[PDB]
């Protein structure tokens, strides 16, 4: 039982993105991002856990970063290297007792 919140819309010529988390922080086992270009299947982008792990999808090395603020029950992912295709519907979930966890998401832009 977890809940999920995010952020990061609009276009800049800087560059911005993130999400957040809700419940019982630092049960932060596999806590992973997802992304869905519309009319396509699901997709996982970046994975970060409690143990300072850092691994990404084959497309966002250089393009992205994972961050983990244990204080205000949140995990961060900050976009870099503007390129529009990253426009999509998003999600930012985690795993706890192995239960399928999911949220809502956000969008990305051009120019």
């Amino acid at each position: 039982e977890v809940q999920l919140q995010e952020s990061g819309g609009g276009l800049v010529y800087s560059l911005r993105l993130s999400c957040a988390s809700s419940r019982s922080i630092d049960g932060i086992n596999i806590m992973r991002w997802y992304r869905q270009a519309p009319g396509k299947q699901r997709g996982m982008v970046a994975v970060v856990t409690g143990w300072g792990s850092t691994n990404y999808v084959d497309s966002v090395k250089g393009r992205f970063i994972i961050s983990r603020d244990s204080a205000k029950d949140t995990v961060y992912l900050q976009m870099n290297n503007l390129k529009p295709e990253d426009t999509a519907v998003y999600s930012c979930n985690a795993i706890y007792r192995g239960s399928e966890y999911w949220g809502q998401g956000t969008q990305v832009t051009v120019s």
């Binding site: 039982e1 239960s99 399928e100």
Partner: peptide, 22 residues
């Protein structure tokens, strides 16, 4: 138990989407 039934929750939202289309 609870983990199974939460998987079940999300998975019937999937079910309801499919049933809507069909």
């Amino acid at each position: 138990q609870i983990e199974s039934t939460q998987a079940i929750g999300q998975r019937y939202e999937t079910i309801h989407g499919g049933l809507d289309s069909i």
